[PDB]
Design a protein around this nucleic acid. Structure first.
Lengths: 134, 174, 197, 118, 170
RNA sequence: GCUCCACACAGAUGGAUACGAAUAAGGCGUCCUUGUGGCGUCGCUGAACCAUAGCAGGCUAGCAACGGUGCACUUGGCGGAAAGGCCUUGGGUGCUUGCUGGCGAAUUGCAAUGCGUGGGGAUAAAUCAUUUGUAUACGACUUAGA
RNA sequence: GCAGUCAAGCGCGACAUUGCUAUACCGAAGCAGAAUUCGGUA
RNA sequence: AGAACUGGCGAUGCGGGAUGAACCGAACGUAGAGUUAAGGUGCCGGAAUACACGCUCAUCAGACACAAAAGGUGUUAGUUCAUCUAGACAGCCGGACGGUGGCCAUGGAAGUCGGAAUCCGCUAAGGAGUGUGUAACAACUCACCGGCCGAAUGAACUA
């Protein structure tokens, strides 16, 4: 009987899908191909659209999702492995991508849509309050 | 700079190790020992339920020192829990007999009226020799050191005068 | 953004926190600092203790009282640190300082109100890992502060019954989430989900 | 002289105020700690010293003493103090239903001309 | 951003010496003017040719063959400092020669305090196979199945006040 | 302080929306042998949650809920660190945009946001006067006299 | 100081070297005890 | 101390430099809009708690050329050599001999209180001995090899 708790870290490695935080391809997924050094990692996001390049780890944030990928894979092989792993489907199901989509939708809302949202929220609150205390 | 350096600790079938945030706990036949390592900044893993790894990432020699000493401390704790540690000291006197009563009090040391007392932090048992045993190595060792360091022969020749109590033997209780 | 901002000073750098508080004060923002005794300063304890002595060693000969004043309370130390960052001896500076309040712990009614932190001033976010640091409370106790015991004693009571308040809030949110779930999948809920809500 | 007894300025209050009190005991029963009195006179005292191995052991010794008038003290109320970061604070005070004439006079500077509205 | 340039000079050919040795070398610089100046300085120092009788036959920019291929670069550098000039060799794991030379210049300006003024790039070469690297810090990244975390990430804050007590977990 | 007479009138405009602890770790739900336990789940900023419709927010008729909310009461509890605030039982009185109708907007003309003093009546206290020293150069201080 | 050997380096040049001209508390001493000497805190 | 030639001052305001005679830019009518120099961008102080690579814990650091030649089991990078899967450094175990107790010195000194040479036989390995120690032997030993061990290690220099 042994216990080792709270040791889950998102290791950076080959095949580690990542999300770009800053740069031209900000907000676009990328996959780490080969690690250059402690501060430089090669990434490829052909499915997303970002061209293959060496990016600084400070400009990108890792993600929990992972998939197998041969070291130093080319663009074609990286895209093939990305399609096979279907990491996109897992990404959407995660609450992180859902939060991103919700934020984008809220930023894309209109004044009339905002009024409709307000009315629907009022109705939902009335229904919830009626349900409560019963 | 080292990308990742790890050290291994064995887990005998007779003990169980429960690891959370750096605080470390050990359980075994002789009892349970716990220690705090929140200031050491190391990580632990459960590789196969029988071996415990301590690793440091992007740590230099300064951090590697703590990385390695973590293994030594854990091994010492495991050995103490499984078997324990024993310490002994010898009574030597030329003219004035030394009487010791258990807190441990030393009387009639070099004809000194004052009674030197060393608090007990570890057990006392018995030739003219004391036996100290305890699960924690640090506690028993510090008690022995304090016992040896209270008998200071101030303003006297070190070589000529040998009266006092000194550590003689070390080993496991088993 | 908020008529009054309560900043939790625990685990914060004195320098950055004081600078940001002074800058906000110059902008017309009221700020209240709490848990001053928990404030941290970079460097080992001895260096901070030595630094304190060399600023109070300059006692004026003819008039010590009218000269430098040495305050031991952590709140007083924080105010002195922030005071130098503001253009004092002027009406604009004097007015700004009136918007700042420093207390040890969280005296009421601030104990029942929300508090915030400054990410850029967090000790655990700026200092390099494994580096030595000093605690303002311990330094104040060493240099003469005598209220650390009472401060800790009545701060422990602050956590007491506030854990119970949080437990009650969690129990209420349990029912709130249950009501939201049972109200889900409805036409209004579906429309809200489509509209980003 | 003694820097600890400076500055040498006139005392503001004629009656000396106690700065500290004996440490409280949580096991001993409730008991008093201080008493009030008035100094009155001085005289000589002689006795025999029982101090062991002394120059005057089991033999007479003389010195000077003083006498303080200590009439019985009567309580008038109880004061409670709480622990606060800024120092001990008095939150509530309760006084007795009846008070002595001297106590009432103490709260007056023109007692003869005042209405004695104690 | 550094750039790689090729410069060739043949000292203004005169009678009885047509088409001289035509000294050739590769110069790393941020612009053509700096590349030409560095080429002139190198010719004056190493060789006996000066700009008085010199001539720039042609200057061209060389682009790395595989800008998306990770390589181990071995660089021989001769630089001058407060003490006497001495040779130096270093190994860099980069993607392109330009990036490798830029990192070398940054390291020299950081550690040895040597700047672009007193640094010479003798040769840049690619290490083909493993076990030819002679630097431990470069061998560090050559281990098979290399995985490591990024503890204590320095998250950036866009607002002065944050009601979250952010955690540096990664 | 009580009473009668004469006279004046550094910066709100949604909500400062309450745990603690670690940051080489943490919360939330659930389960069990009740443990530094098992599973799922979340961060990667507050770009968040409540509320936000009505001549600056009126009148009035119905439907469905009987819930939400302002008001003075009313039973009780908590808050001494700067408690002075947090609620909680019962009813009453209004709104309810939760839902469906009928009335007015205009001319403002294309915008210059749109609560003590001074004169009396009575009554609590203080200074001097007076006088004792415990204080004393003079200030100042401790006392006594309906 | 004068005169000679030096020689990591740059005819100059390193460590050695040859002739005159208070109280109190700790560490060491062949501290047997006392007494004493040398170093440190102040 | 006194002279010879040469650029600013002096007759000179402005910005920057905590202030400024030997410092930088800029040499001047009264106004509006815009772009800059030196100098700056955590507050005082108008401007990024910008990016990237490395460095330093300093018990009086640091942000200002003499005392600076050297010292440090402080740290990060380089150069010249030695060992190296014929087994790298390190930690334990074993061997660590015979003439011999070399000659002289002897109150007793046998490698280690002293003086002068340092050999053969060898064996994978013995200095007629690097130390602790006894009035002398006794006992341990490092340097020298072997065995258990498993990859890079060591000596000297430069930043």
């Amino acid at each position: 009987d042994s216990i080792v708790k709270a040791s889950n870290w998102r290791l950076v490695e080959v095949g580690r899908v990542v999300l770009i935080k800053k740069g031209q391809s900000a907000g676009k997924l990328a996959a780490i191909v080969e690690i250059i050094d402690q501060k430089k990692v090669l990434i490829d996001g052909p499915k997303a659209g970002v061209p293959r390049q060496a990016i600084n780890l400070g400009q990108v944030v890792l993600t929990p999702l992972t998939f197998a990928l041969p070291r130093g894979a080319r663009t074609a092989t990286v895209s093939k492995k990305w399609a096979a792993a279907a990491v996109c489907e897992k990404w959407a199901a995660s609450s992180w991508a859902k939060k991103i989509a919700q934020r984008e939708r809220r930023a894309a809302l209109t004044d009339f849509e905002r009024f409709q949202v307000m009315v629907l929220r009022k109705q939902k609150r009335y229904t919830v309050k009626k349900a409560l205390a019963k | 700079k080292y990308i990742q350096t790890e050290q291994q600790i064995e887990v005998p079938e007779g003990v169980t190790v429960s690891i959370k945030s750096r605080i470390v706990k050990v359980v075994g036949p002789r009892g349970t020992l716990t220690k705090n390592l929140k200031h050491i900044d190391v990580t632990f893993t459960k590789v196969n339920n029988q071996l415990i790894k301590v690793a440091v990432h992007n740590g230099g020699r300064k951090h590697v020192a703590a990385l390695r000493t973590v293994k030594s401390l854990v091994d010492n704790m495991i050995t103490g829990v499984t078997k324990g540690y024993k310490y002994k000291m010898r009574y030597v006197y030329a003219h004035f007999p030394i009487n010791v009563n258990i807190f441990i009090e030393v009387r009639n040391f070099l004809g000194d009226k004052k009674i030197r007392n060393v608090p007990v932090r570890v057990t006392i048992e018995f030739k003219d020799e004391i036996v100290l045993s305890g699960n924690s190595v640090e506690d028993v060792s510090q008690n022995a050191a304090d016992l040896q360091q209270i008998c200071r022969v101030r303003n006297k020749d070190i070589r000529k005068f040998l009266d006092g109590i000194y550590v003689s033997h070390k080993g496991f209780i088993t | 953004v908020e008529p009054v901002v309560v900043i939790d000073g625990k685990g914060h750098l004195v320098g950055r926190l004081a600078s940001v508080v002074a800058k906000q004060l110059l902008n017309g923002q009221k700020i209240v600092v709490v848990r001053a005794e928990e404030l941290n300063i970079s460097g080992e304890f001895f260096r901070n203790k030595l630094k304190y002595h060399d600023f109070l060693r300059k006692a004026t000969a003819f008039n010590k009282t009218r000269g430098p004043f040495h305050f031991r309370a952590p709140s007083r130390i924080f105010y002195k640190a922030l005071r130098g960052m503001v253009s004092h001896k002027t009406a604009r500076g004097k007015a700004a300082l009136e918007r700042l309040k420093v207390f040890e712990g969280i005296p009421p009614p601030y104990d029942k109100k929300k508090r915030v932190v400054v990410p850029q001033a967090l000790r655990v976010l700026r200092l390099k890992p494994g580096r030595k640091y000093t605690t303002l409370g311990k330094l104040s106790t060493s240099v003469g502060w005598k209220y650390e015991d009472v401060v800790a004693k009545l701060e422990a009571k602050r956590k007491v019954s506030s854990a119970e308040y949080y437990a009650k809030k969690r129990a209420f949110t349990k029912k709130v989430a249950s009501a939201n779930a049972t109200a889900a999948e409805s036409d209004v809920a579906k429309q809200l989900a489509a509209l980003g809500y | 002289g003694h820097l600890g007894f400076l500055p040498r300025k006139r005392a503001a209050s004629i009656r000396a105020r106690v700065k500290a009190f004996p440490k409280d005991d949580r096991s001993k029963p409730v008991a008093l700690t201080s008493f009030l009195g008035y100094k009155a006179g001085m005289t000589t005292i002689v006795r025999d010293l029982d101090r062991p191995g002394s120059k005057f052991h089991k033999r007479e010794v003389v010195e000077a003493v003083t006498v303080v008038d200590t009439p019985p003290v009567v309580v008038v109320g109880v004061v409670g103090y709480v622990e606060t970061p800024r120092g001990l604070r008095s939150l509530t005070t309760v006084w007795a239903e009846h008070l002595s004439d001297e106590v009432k006079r103490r709260f007056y500077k023109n007692w003869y001309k005042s209405k004695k509205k104690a | 951003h550094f750039k790689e340039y090729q410069v060739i000079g043949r000292r203004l050919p005169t009678e009885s010496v047509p088409e001289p040795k035509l000294f050739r070398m590769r110069i790393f610089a941020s612009n053509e003017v700096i590349a030409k100046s560095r080429y002139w300085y190198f010719l004056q120092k190493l060789h006996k040719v000066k700009k008085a009788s010199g001539e720039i036959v042609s200057i061209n920019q060389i682009n790395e063959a595989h800008p998306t291929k990770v390589k181990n670069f071995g660089v021989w550098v001769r630089y001058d400092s407060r003490s006497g000039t001495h040779n130096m060799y270093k190994e860099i794991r980069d993607v392109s020669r330009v990036a490798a030379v830029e990192t070398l210049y940054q390291d020299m300006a950081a550690r040895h305090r040597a700047r672009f003024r007193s640094i010479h790039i003798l040769k840049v070469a690619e290490i083909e196979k493993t076990a030819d690297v002679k630097r431990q810090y470069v061998k560090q990244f050559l281990t098979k199945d290399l995985k490591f975390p990024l503890p204590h990430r320095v998250q950036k804050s866009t607002k002065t006040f944050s009601y979250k007590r952010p955690s540096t977990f990664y």
